[PDB]
Short mmCIF file of C-alpha atoms and ligand atoms in Angstrom, two decimals:
data_model
loop_
_atom_site.label_atom_id
_atom_site.label_comp_id
_atom_site.label_asym_id
_atom_site.label_seq_id
_atom_site.Cartn_x
_atom_site.Cartn_y
_atom_site.Cartn_z
CA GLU A 1 -18.05 5.16 10.54
CA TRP A 2 -16.92 4.01 7.04
CA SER A 3 -16.87 0.75 5.07
CA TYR A 4 -16.14 -0.73 1.67
CA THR A 5 -19.35 -2.81 1.24
CA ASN A 6 -22.17 -0.99 3.14
CA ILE A 7 -23.71 1.39 0.53
CA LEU A 8 -24.76 3.79 3.42
CA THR A 9 -21.09 4.27 4.61
CA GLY A 10 -19.20 3.04 1.46
CA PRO A 11 -16.74 4.84 -0.79
CA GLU A 12 -19.38 6.81 -2.84
CA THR A 13 -20.39 8.55 0.44
CA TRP A 14 -16.92 9.57 1.67
CA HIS A 15 -16.88 12.93 -0.23
CA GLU A 16 -19.90 13.96 1.95
CA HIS A 17 -19.13 12.19 5.29
CA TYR A 18 -15.36 13.17 5.30
CA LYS A 19 -15.23 16.29 3.09
CA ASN A 20 -11.79 17.07 4.69
CA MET A 21 -10.24 15.64 2.53
CA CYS A 22 -12.26 12.96 0.64
CA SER A 23 -13.87 15.88 -1.39
CA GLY A 24 -10.44 16.98 -2.71
CA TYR A 25 -9.02 17.05 -6.25
CA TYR A 26 -5.70 15.20 -5.42
CA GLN A 27 -7.26 11.84 -4.51
CA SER A 28 -5.94 8.29 -4.87
CA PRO A 29 -6.01 5.71 -6.35
CA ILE A 30 -5.81 6.65 -10.04
CA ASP A 31 -5.42 4.85 -13.34
CA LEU A 32 -1.67 4.85 -14.04
CA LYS A 33 -1.58 5.63 -17.78
CA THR A 34 1.77 4.76 -19.43
CA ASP A 35 1.03 6.94 -22.53
CA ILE A 36 -0.30 9.96 -20.45
CA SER A 37 2.61 10.11 -18.00
CA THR A 38 5.85 12.13 -18.06
CA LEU A 39 9.17 10.22 -17.93
CA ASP A 40 11.47 11.92 -15.40
CA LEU A 41 15.01 10.48 -15.63
CA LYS A 42 15.88 12.29 -12.32
CA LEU A 43 13.73 9.77 -10.29
CA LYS A 44 16.20 7.22 -8.84
CA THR A 45 16.03 3.54 -7.89
CA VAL A 46 14.09 2.96 -4.65
CA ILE A 47 16.04 1.33 -1.75
CA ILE A 48 14.46 -0.31 1.32
CA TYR A 49 16.91 -0.81 4.22
CA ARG A 50 16.90 -1.93 7.83
CA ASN A 51 18.57 -0.68 11.01
CA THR A 52 20.72 -3.78 12.02
CA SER A 53 20.53 -2.70 15.74
CA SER A 54 16.71 -2.90 15.98
CA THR A 55 15.46 -5.98 17.97
CA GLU A 56 11.77 -5.07 18.54
CA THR A 57 9.04 -7.44 17.30
CA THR A 58 6.78 -7.01 14.24
CA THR A 59 3.02 -7.66 14.71
CA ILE A 60 0.07 -8.13 12.36
CA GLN A 61 -3.54 -7.11 13.10
CA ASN A 62 -6.91 -7.70 11.45
CA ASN A 63 -8.07 -4.05 11.77
CA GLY A 64 -11.49 -4.88 10.21
CA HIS A 65 -10.46 -3.30 6.88
CA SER A 66 -7.19 -5.16 5.96
CA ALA A 67 -4.35 -7.28 7.28
CA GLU A 68 -1.97 -4.64 8.72
CA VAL A 69 1.68 -5.43 9.53
CA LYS A 70 2.87 -2.97 12.21
CA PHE A 71 6.65 -2.39 12.11
CA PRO A 72 8.53 -1.17 15.17
CA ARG A 73 9.84 2.41 15.15
CA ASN A 74 13.37 3.17 13.84
CA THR A 75 13.65 -0.16 11.96
CA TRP A 76 12.80 -0.03 8.25
CA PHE A 77 13.50 2.91 5.92
CA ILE A 78 13.13 4.03 2.33
CA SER A 79 15.69 5.99 0.33
CA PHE A 80 14.75 7.73 -2.93
CA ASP A 81 18.17 9.43 -3.32
CA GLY A 82 20.73 6.60 -2.73
CA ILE A 83 21.72 7.96 0.75
CA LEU A 84 20.92 5.73 3.79
CA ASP A 85 20.23 8.70 6.13
CA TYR A 86 16.71 7.80 7.34
CA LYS A 87 14.69 10.41 5.41
CA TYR A 88 11.62 8.11 5.19
CA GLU A 89 10.72 5.68 7.99
CA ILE A 90 8.32 2.74 7.40
CA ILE A 91 5.31 2.46 9.76
CA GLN A 92 3.16 -0.41 8.47
CA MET A 93 2.26 -2.50 5.42
CA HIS A 94 -1.30 -3.55 4.50
CA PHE A 95 -3.15 -5.06 1.54
CA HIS A 96 -6.06 -4.58 -0.85
CA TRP A 97 -7.62 -7.60 -2.60
CA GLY A 98 -10.68 -8.88 -4.47
CA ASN A 99 -13.44 -11.42 -3.89
CA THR A 100 -12.22 -12.82 -7.26
CA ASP A 101 -8.81 -13.00 -8.99
CA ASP A 102 -9.62 -10.37 -11.66
CA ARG A 103 -9.85 -7.42 -9.19
CA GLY A 104 -8.45 -6.20 -5.87
CA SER A 105 -5.81 -3.54 -6.58
CA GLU A 106 -6.55 0.14 -5.84
CA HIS A 107 -4.39 1.50 -8.67
CA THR A 108 -4.83 0.21 -12.24
CA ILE A 109 -2.05 0.16 -14.86
CA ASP A 110 -3.55 1.18 -18.21
CA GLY A 111 -6.96 0.06 -16.90
CA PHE A 112 -5.71 -3.37 -15.63
CA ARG A 113 -6.56 -4.52 -12.06
CA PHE A 114 -4.22 -6.87 -10.15
CA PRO A 115 -5.55 -9.37 -7.58
CA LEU A 116 -3.55 -7.88 -4.64
CA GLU A 117 -1.91 -4.47 -4.00
CA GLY A 118 0.41 -4.07 -1.00
CA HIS A 119 1.00 -0.61 0.55
CA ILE A 120 4.18 0.16 2.46
CA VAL A 121 3.40 3.32 4.47
CA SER A 122 6.28 5.63 5.54
CA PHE A 123 6.60 9.15 7.09
CA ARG A 124 9.00 11.91 6.04
CA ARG A 125 11.30 11.63 9.10
CA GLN A 126 13.53 14.20 7.29
CA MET A 127 10.91 16.82 8.40
CA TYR A 128 8.66 15.21 11.06
CA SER A 129 9.78 13.51 14.31
CA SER A 130 7.04 10.79 14.50
CA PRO A 131 4.22 9.10 12.56
CA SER A 132 1.59 10.96 14.66
CA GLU A 133 3.25 14.32 13.74
CA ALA A 134 3.45 13.43 10.01
CA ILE A 135 0.14 11.63 9.35
CA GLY A 136 -2.05 14.80 9.29
CA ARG A 137 0.50 17.34 8.04
CA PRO A 138 1.49 18.50 4.56
CA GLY A 139 4.01 16.32 2.70
CA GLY A 140 4.01 13.92 5.72
CA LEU A 141 3.69 10.52 4.02
CA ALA A 142 5.14 8.36 1.25
CA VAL A 143 3.50 5.04 0.24
CA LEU A 144 4.99 2.29 -1.97
CA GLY A 145 2.51 0.26 -4.00
CA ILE A 146 3.45 -3.34 -4.92
CA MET A 147 1.26 -5.21 -7.41
CA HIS A 148 1.00 -8.99 -7.09
CA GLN A 149 0.06 -11.41 -9.89
CA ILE A 150 -1.03 -15.10 -9.61
CA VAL A 151 1.10 -17.81 -11.30
CA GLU A 152 0.23 -21.58 -11.39
CA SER A 153 3.89 -22.85 -11.51
CA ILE A 154 6.30 -21.40 -8.88
CA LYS A 155 8.44 -22.47 -5.86
CA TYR A 156 7.39 -20.90 -2.52
CA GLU A 157 10.90 -19.30 -2.31
CA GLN A 158 10.33 -17.13 -5.41
CA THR A 159 6.85 -15.94 -4.26
CA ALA A 160 6.27 -12.73 -2.30
CA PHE A 161 5.20 -14.99 0.67
CA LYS A 162 8.93 -15.95 1.20
CA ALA A 163 9.58 -12.23 1.97
CA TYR A 164 6.39 -12.22 4.14
CA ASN A 165 7.41 -15.51 5.89
CA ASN A 166 3.75 -16.54 5.23
CA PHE A 167 2.78 -13.88 7.90
CA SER A 168 3.62 -16.77 10.38
CA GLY A 169 0.28 -18.47 9.37
CA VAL A 170 -2.01 -15.75 10.87
CA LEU A 171 -4.10 -15.43 7.63
CA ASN A 172 -7.04 -17.76 8.51
CA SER A 173 -10.77 -17.71 9.40
CA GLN A 174 -10.02 -17.41 13.14
CA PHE A 175 -7.94 -14.17 12.81
CA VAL A 176 -10.86 -11.95 13.87
CA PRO A 177 -10.68 -8.19 14.38
CA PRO A 178 -9.12 -6.52 16.32
CA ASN A 179 -6.75 -9.45 17.04
CA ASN A 180 -3.00 -8.90 16.71
CA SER A 181 -0.20 -11.51 16.79
CA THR A 182 3.58 -11.32 16.90
CA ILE A 183 5.00 -12.47 13.51
CA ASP A 184 8.46 -13.03 12.06
CA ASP A 185 9.82 -9.76 10.57
CA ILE A 186 9.02 -9.14 6.86
CA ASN A 187 12.15 -9.05 4.64
CA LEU A 188 11.11 -5.88 2.80
CA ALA A 189 14.50 -5.75 0.96
CA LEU A 190 13.89 -9.24 -0.51
CA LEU A 191 10.35 -8.18 -1.45
CA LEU A 192 11.64 -5.18 -3.39
CA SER A 193 14.25 -7.42 -5.16
CA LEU A 194 11.33 -9.52 -6.66
CA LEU A 195 10.51 -6.56 -8.97
CA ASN A 196 12.44 -3.76 -10.76
CA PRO A 197 12.86 -1.02 -8.09
CA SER A 198 13.75 1.57 -10.84
CA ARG A 199 10.49 1.16 -12.83
CA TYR A 200 7.58 3.01 -11.20
CA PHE A 201 4.85 5.60 -11.44
CA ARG A 202 5.15 8.68 -9.20
CA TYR A 203 2.52 11.28 -8.26
CA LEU A 204 1.20 13.36 -5.39
CA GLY A 205 -2.10 12.03 -3.97
CA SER A 206 -3.96 10.88 -0.89
CA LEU A 207 -4.71 8.21 1.62
CA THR A 208 -7.29 5.83 0.08
CA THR A 209 -9.52 5.55 3.19
CA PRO A 210 -11.12 8.35 5.20
CA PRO A 211 -9.96 10.99 5.86
CA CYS A 212 -8.28 10.72 2.41
CA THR A 213 -5.53 13.22 3.47
CA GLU A 214 -3.78 14.81 0.42
CA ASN A 215 -0.26 14.39 1.86
CA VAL A 216 0.95 11.15 0.17
CA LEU A 217 3.92 10.88 -2.19
CA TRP A 218 2.89 7.80 -4.23
CA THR A 219 5.31 5.32 -5.82
CA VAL A 220 3.66 2.38 -7.64
CA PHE A 221 6.04 -0.23 -9.15
CA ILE A 222 5.01 -1.35 -12.67
CA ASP A 223 6.35 -4.95 -12.46
CA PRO A 224 4.36 -7.25 -10.14
CA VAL A 225 5.76 -9.71 -7.63
CA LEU A 226 4.35 -13.25 -7.85
CA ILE A 227 1.89 -15.25 -5.67
CA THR A 228 -0.25 -18.38 -6.04
CA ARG A 229 -4.04 -18.82 -5.89
CA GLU A 230 -3.53 -20.65 -2.55
CA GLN A 231 -1.81 -17.51 -1.15
CA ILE A 232 -4.53 -15.02 -2.39
CA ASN A 233 -7.26 -17.24 -0.86
CA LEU A 234 -5.50 -17.00 2.56
CA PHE A 235 -6.39 -13.25 2.64
CA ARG A 236 -10.02 -14.12 1.69
CA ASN A 237 -10.29 -16.27 4.87
CA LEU A 238 -10.16 -13.09 7.07
CA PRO A 239 -13.47 -11.82 8.43
CA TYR A 240 -14.48 -8.21 7.78
CA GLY A 241 -15.18 -5.86 10.72
CA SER A 242 -18.85 -5.52 11.85
CA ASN A 243 -19.08 -2.14 9.91
CA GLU A 244 -19.20 -4.20 6.64
CA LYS A 245 -22.26 -5.78 4.83
CA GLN A 246 -19.98 -8.64 3.45
CA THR A 247 -18.80 -11.28 6.06
CA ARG A 248 -15.52 -12.33 4.32
CA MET A 249 -12.82 -9.66 3.80
CA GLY A 250 -12.51 -8.83 0.09
CA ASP A 251 -13.08 -5.93 -2.34
CA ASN A 252 -11.33 -3.77 0.32
CA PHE A 253 -10.32 -1.24 -2.41
CA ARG A 254 -11.38 2.33 -3.17
CA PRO A 255 -12.73 3.12 -6.63
CA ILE A 256 -10.59 4.93 -9.21
CA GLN A 257 -10.24 8.74 -8.91
CA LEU A 258 -9.26 11.12 -11.76
CA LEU A 259 -5.77 12.62 -11.90
CA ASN A 260 -7.51 16.02 -12.54
CA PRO A 261 -11.21 16.30 -11.64
CA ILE A 262 -12.90 19.21 -13.58
CA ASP A 263 -12.98 21.38 -10.39
CA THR A 264 -9.13 21.21 -9.81
CA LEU A 265 -7.44 24.59 -9.11
CA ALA A 266 -3.95 23.36 -10.10
CA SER A 267 -3.43 20.24 -12.27
CA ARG A 268 -1.07 17.51 -11.05
CA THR A 269 1.11 15.42 -13.36
CA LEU A 270 1.68 11.62 -13.37
CA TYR A 271 5.43 10.86 -13.62
CA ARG A 272 7.18 7.58 -14.56
CA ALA A 273 10.74 6.40 -13.71
CA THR A 274 12.99 3.84 -15.47
CA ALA A 275 16.54 2.52 -14.93
CA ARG A 276 19.54 4.53 -16.25
CA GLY A 277 19.99 3.21 -19.87
N1 7TI B 301 -2.47 4.46 5.42
C1 7TI B 301 -3.56 3.62 5.45
C2 7TI B 301 -4.10 3.24 6.69
C3 7TI B 301 -5.20 2.38 6.80
C4 7TI B 301 -6.04 2.29 8.02
CL1 7TI B 301 -7.55 3.23 7.88
C5 7TI B 301 -5.72 1.64 9.12
CL2 7TI B 301 -6.75 1.46 10.51
CL3 7TI B 301 -4.13 1.01 9.27
C6 7TI B 301 -5.71 1.80 5.64
S1 7TI B 301 -6.88 0.43 5.71
N2 7TI B 301 -8.14 0.95 6.47
O1 7TI B 301 -6.25 -0.61 6.45
O2 7TI B 301 -7.28 0.12 4.35
C7 7TI B 301 -5.23 2.20 4.40
C8 7TI B 301 -4.19 3.12 4.29
S2 7TI B 301 -3.73 3.69 2.67
N3 7TI B 301 -4.42 2.76 1.58
O3 7TI B 301 -2.30 3.54 2.55
O4 7TI B 301 -4.28 5.02 2.50
C1 NAG B 302 18.52 1.80 15.35
O1 NAG B 302 17.97 1.00 16.39
C2 NAG B 302 18.56 1.36 17.69
C3 NAG B 302 18.17 0.29 18.72
O2 NAG B 302 16.75 0.13 18.87
C4 NAG B 302 18.12 2.78 18.09
O3 NAG B 302 18.59 3.22 19.41
C5 NAG B 302 18.54 3.75 16.95
O4 NAG B 302 18.02 5.08 17.14
C6 NAG B 302 18.04 3.25 15.58
N1 NAG B 302 18.46 4.14 14.47
C7 NAG B 302 17.68 4.97 13.75
C8 NAG B 302 18.43 5.68 12.63
O5 NAG B 302 16.47 5.09 13.95
C1 NAG B 303 5.07 -21.23 3.98
O1 NAG B 303 4.03 -21.93 3.23
C2 NAG B 303 4.08 -23.32 2.76
C3 NAG B 303 3.10 -24.24 3.60
O2 NAG B 303 1.84 -24.67 3.03
C4 NAG B 303 5.48 -23.93 2.90
O3 NAG B 303 5.90 -24.61 1.69
C5 NAG B 303 6.57 -23.01 3.45
O4 NAG B 303 7.60 -23.87 3.87
C6 NAG B 303 6.14 -22.09 4.60
N1 NAG B 303 7.23 -21.26 5.12
C7 NAG B 303 7.55 -21.05 6.41
C8 NAG B 303 8.67 -20.07 6.70
O5 NAG B 303 6.96 -21.58 7.31
ZN1 ZN B 304 -3.65 0.97 1.27
#
């Protein structure tokens, strides 16, 4: 198995235990370096949109690694080109956080760690008919990264937790793995409106847990959405799976990978996007 906190099965081991593909040279997360990135004005505003006809329930599970929101099929989509033609279909959203407020994110922005990084996972429905077809195949996946930052003074309604509908209260010490509960749907469009959806890093990388598949189109928004200390401590109430050394769920993030390890056979480039000025 694998873990975050057991040194025998933890992230420094994955390159050996899961060489396909945790030994690769296109791994994630990376440090997102504003100065050492290429501005590409062709990269458009991201849109998240829902199929109005979908009625199926959303669930959340403590999978032992994270809190994972499981979206029904054919419901939530991403557009990178302004057309609402279902090229990318959202599967799930999960989170990475810290034992303490000064770490938790997988990506860094110029070396800075956020307390909470959310990952919206989608498959390239344009090419592949289902998640199970896309998840192991080339170019199959696109993930959105959303940074969260803690503020002392804020109304609930302008926090990310309004979009999350507080996960219907499931974030607590009794939400043990592998428990799943029905929750209110997540308003992913409202979530995206809490930041600038034109301002993002873009690169080709990997899943950040084994098997670290190098088939992820990454988009990481530079502006964070806002949460309170009370909200970040809700995540810290979840218990880790029995694979972990630590009892409480926290520090569920992979260490930083290089954009171009010395052994790369073809360098990748970190791109940045900004709004049409
Ligand atoms: N796509 C994905 C899946 C999972 C796992 Cl393995 C689940 Cl069991 Cl949902 C997780 S996990 N184990 O919830 O952190 C992370 C990702 S990520 N960071 O987007 O690479
Ligand atoms: C929208 O949801 C309906 C009802 O569940 C479904 O039959 C339809 O295929 C969905 N549309 C897309 C584009 O997935
Ligand atoms: C979510 O969290 C706080 C309760 O401590 C509250 O102010 C808010 O009304 C809750 N929202 C919903 C939808 O229950
Ligand atoms: Zn993730």
